[PDB]
């Protein structure tokens with residue numbers, strides 16, 4: 001009983017290694033044409049009234065806003081005599097950066113992104129203080145685009161400098177210790193627009209050096225690899241200022257080349273392409289800089305260590321036969337990151353069965369000294385420099401918005417103190433609980449899953465479930481706080497489940513590789529098995545399951561609705577990759593071939609064609625679940641044509657179906673992108689639309 005927008009079908013046949021593949025909506029890849037704009041408008045004119053017709057939408061939006069309305073803080077970061085921290089009074093579109101002269105002083109606004117946009121669509125993206133804390137560089141992004149403009153302020157005064165760096169994307173921000181400028185990345189000029197609405201591929205990223213007090217036209221090109229247009233040049237200046245550490249990436253795997261420049265031995269100031277020394281000249285493993293003491297550099301690596309470890313490489317004797325293990329790989333836990341504090345101490349953060357743990361190690365020996373106690377959850381913030389004597393860290397969990405701890409590092413015992421508690425106002429979290437289960441996938445592998453629910457729940461199959469997954473790119477889905485999840489559990493009888501399917505990083509690089517490239521189908525099998533587990537154990541029934549994922553998790557949703565429409569009642573795919581044959585042709589999509597392969601390869605095509613959601617829509621005996629696609633017109637990470645073409649093809653497939661009664665809809669936002677930096681107002685509206693769609697499609701019941 002739904003009438004879907006018209007969408008012209010333009011037969012386009014292409015040959016993939018002998019296999020003919022036909023598509024009909026390639027015209028939707030042009031975001032600027034009147035035809036595409038009319039399609040977008042028509043889809044919004046269908047979905048918006050449907051979402052706005054939810055009879056509980058006002059209560060739902062009000063409750064999400066009320067739960068969300070609590071003051072928020074980042075860890076305080078020391079920079080000289082001042083601490084800097086982000087603050088949100090509760091519902092501001094963007095958090096404000098405050099400065100205070102000591103932890104006990106009156107704070108003052110240092111940088112307010114809300115003052116830069118009337119709707120909060122300008123966000124920070126990357127920040128870096130100079131080594132003397134007298135200058136502050138920061139990136140600004142508009143309308144959610146990955147494109148960045150780097151600007152500069154005096155610190156702590158916050159006075160603006162004129163320096164403005166354009167065409168920045170995926171950028172380093174590394175000050176030299178002479179305080180004269182910084183290294184950053186940018187792309188040379190390109191055909192067409194560069195505002196986040198274009199689909200143009202980004203290649204040949206350059207490393208530049210900008211001198212404070214000059215126009216960007218004077219910036220020096222310091223590194224480029226034109227014979228490797230997909231290489232991306234990470235730049236960091238060593239803790240002593242002497243070395244530029246160059247970490248070169250190609251694609252999204254946790255591996256990099258490792259080169260360096262001796263800046264103090266240069267016979268001239270930074271003037272042109274720098275002469276570097278190669279330490280690691282391959283992509284076999286990760287080398288992530290932690291710290292250095294003179295020429296001895298400490299790196300996190302996965303070299304022969306899928307769960308990660310720390311090694312020492314001395315630049316004075318850099319052959320691999322001289323490298324030394326500093327911290328052994330753990331038998332079971334993934335080392336997520338390490339930081340050096342108070343000259344010779346290390347904070348190591350591990351993931352053990354999808355929960356974070358913190359330990360203090362000595363830098364000289366690598367030996368473990370202490371554990372910093374935590375509840376079950378995630379460490380989402382950290383501050384603590386080698387030159388300072390205390391750390392702060394922020395903890396979050398499903399029922400805990402935040403706890404900030406402070407720990408003095410000057411003695412041989414470590415007794416963290418609670419610095420701040422961030423709680424929802426007037427909400428009894430003790431009515432709810434989280435369980436961790438391990439369910440068998442098709443091949444026998446046990447997969448972790450968190451289930452958040454009201455205490456006293458009985459397993460009668462009656463509860464609506466929100467089942468979330470991602471499954472890729474070495475990303476672990478660890479506990480975190482969601483205000484809308486609380487509203488779902490409190491007022492909509494909901495059960496929230498997160499399946500830690502393969503492709504993520506939860507158990508290290510073997511977990512990641514078990515869910516990428518030719519093994520990508522394992523991810524979808526794992527997620528389908530999660531739904532089967534919830535049904536079999538009578539948490540829910542298929543008709544009451546909503547699946548949700550974003551980005552690579554939107555691919556997860558698209559593949560799962562094609563493969564097992566019978567397992568789900570509703571599906572919400574945000575900013576999803578859905579044309580798996582062409583993803584690599586747009587913006588930064590070429591970087592994802594390390595998880596997906598590429599249709600340019602015969603072997604990879606045989607894998608991709610089996611699951612590419614755009615190419616696998618088929619009516620089954622069971623109807624497809626209700627579907628809501630969400631994207632933004634400035635999502636230049638995953639270009640919105642993915643959602644647009646999938647929507648056109650799915651609506652066409654079921655145009656004349658008697659059995660398809662669930663709606664298949666899309667909402668295309670304006671002035672927003674992939675998600676980072678999206679203003680609070682848009683986030684709350686999106687969450688309201690998501691749960692409104694579920695209410696209207698799987699029969700949720702609101703209880704006051």
Ligand SMILES: O=C([C@@H]1C[C@@H](O)CN1C(=O)CCCOc1ccccc1/C=C/c1ccccc1)N1CCSC1
Nearest residue numbers: 170171232249251252473551552577588591592637638
């Ligand atoms: O978004 C994604 C994936 C998932 C996750 O891997 C990130 N990612 C990207 O594509 C990020 C774009 C490539 O960036 C890099 C490439 C190589 C090495 C480093 C970087 C990032 C440095 C940087 C970035 C920003 C600021 C400063 C520095 N997907 C969408 C659909 S599935 C994949």
